[PDB]
Write a protein of this length. Structure first.
Lengths: 154, 100
């Protein structure tokens, strides 16, 4: 489940970062266009009038793009934070999943323990301890029964 | 003007780093506030001082780092109280048997 979440957030984060980089590229190109139309306004219905109009328009578009970039930054960070949490949990999940089991033990554990959805994935860490509580009580009860049968043996 | 635009780019990059910090802490603080108000609601049930000091006994004192662990510590202490309750019950019914 962590790998699924990680892949989804990876795709979302990549697309958001691409959009943000395009916004920044447009903003810097607006700055360059400002410089170029200023030089044209200096060195050239004349070309100078068109350069002045385009200079003012480029400055307005520069402000628009700067505000758009500011707004677009946040979503990328939210996606990145979620992805970081998912990856951090996924590393331990991978480590604990590979410890070693017979497929028969996989059948044993799977048939007893719940299948997990993404919202239950945070819940799985708490569910491990919770289920361990009752399993421990059952372990001690069956152990007491085993001791009784040992007394019968004696 | 060109130099001012370059400095504007530099300031924009600094502001974007600050924005990343602010948004990460914003997500974290939103989660923290949701959970805190949840816990406060669960604590609004209220305790007498006697009940508060009674609960202070036998219950754990858990810090922020162990915040995930206090959740299952509540339930494990509940399991311990279950053990104690059911054990004294097991003795109590036998006491009644002997009483009769």
């Amino acid at each position: 489940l962590w790998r699924e979440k990680i892949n989804l957030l990876n795709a979302r984060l990549a697309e958001a970062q691409t959009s943000e980089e395009q916004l920044q590229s447009q903003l810097d190109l607006q700055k360059k266009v400002v410089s170029d139309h200023m030089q044209r306004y200096l060195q050239v219905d004349s070309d100078a009038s068109v350069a002045k109009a385009k200079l003012d328009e480029a400055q307005t578009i520069e402000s628009e793009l700067d505000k758009q970039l500011r707004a677009a930054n946040k979503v990328t960070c939210v996606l990145d934070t979620e992805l970081t949490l998912a990856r951090a949990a996924e590393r331990k999940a991978q480590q604990t999943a590979q410890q070693g089991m017979k497929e028969e033990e996989r059948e044993l554990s799977a048939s007893h323990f719940p299948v997990v959805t993404l919202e239950q994935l945070p819940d799985i860490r708490d569910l491990e301890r919770q289920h361990e509580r009752g399993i421990q009580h059952e372990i001690e009860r069956v152990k007491a029964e085993l001791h009784r049968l040992n007394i019968e043996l004696t």
